[PDB]
């Protein structure tokens, strides 16, 4: 079995290997990359996402989210308070202000220590989940707006044509902006490109050990667990590496820098934080190997998780027994 310790693998495809996206994912899996739940892909030196980032300031962040924490430094939840709209240029200036900017630090490890010590005492503002793309239309390789759609994959594998679309999302971050522990909708893959700015640190639990994380989360967030049998779908809970290590939960960590891709694999729980002002683009995708994970994915039916239009068909076709209850939670 390849990669039996479930380490995060880093790949350096050549420009020739960068042509066929599906083929390269299957290659990474042949080497055991999926066992970690997360992989890094460094694009060939010849590749670029677009020519420059000089003209992005007028993008609108319609609903910036202030991420307010509750709990203790290593075990907390966050809620999202909606703020007034602002442009990317306005948000960049805010991120660089004395109130929100990255503190002085020695290296990524020092910054990680400072994040876990101090996150809860601040409320950073995240421009998340903005439909759109920063890939140039002429970028033919690993263009996250030109991927094969999940609806087409389901149709190719299973023969059933379904409604829905699959488009990318932009994320504008600042110091301490935080992504809570989650797997993707329907335990899909994700791919994330860091277009510009400061790094993003990731934590990930191997898919084979995801239920260990779920059991700890039920212990640590006991009211939330009584409220919903899949409350991590709410995307609000954080648990630090120190707490994971104290409770014996297998995990790994890595820092993504500008110009690098990350892939999350089906049922790979992940969480993380931004180091400073940045912009990332991410989208969900599927492969043949995902289908079995989609069929087994947990679902929130309490009403909290509320997701896209396109998830309806996935539930309806892959999980017909759950459909009625889940749809009630959507309505
Ligand atoms: O970058 C972020 O805030 C969160 N991204 C992801 O969870 C992802 O790409 O799957
Ligand atoms: Mg602009
Ligand atoms: Ni994710
Ligand atoms: Zn729920």
Curated annotation (Swiss-Prot):
Zn(2+) binds at residues 228, 234, 300, 302. Its cofactor is Fe(2+). It catalyses: N(6),N(6),N(6)-trimethyl-L-lysyl(9)-[histone H3] + 2 2-oxoglutarate + 2 O2 = N(6)-methyl-L-lysyl(9)-[histone H3] + 2 formaldehyde + 2 succinate + 2 CO2. Binds 1 Fe(2+) ion per subunit. The modification PolyADP-ribosyl glutamic acid is found at residues 16-17. 2-oxoglutarate binds at residues 126, 192, 200, 235. It is found in: Nucleus. This is Lysine-specific demethylase 4D. GO terms for molecular function: chromatin DNA binding; damaged DNA binding; histone demethylase activity; histone H3K9 demethylase activity; histone H3K9me2/H3K9me3 demethylase activity; metal ion binding. Keywords: ADP-ribosylation, Chromatin regulator, Dioxygenase, Iron, Metal-binding, Nucleus, Oxidoreductase, Transcription, Transcription regulation, Ubl conjugation, Zinc. The keyword Transcription applies. One of its GO terms (cellular component) is blood microparticle. Residues 8-50 form the JmjN domain.
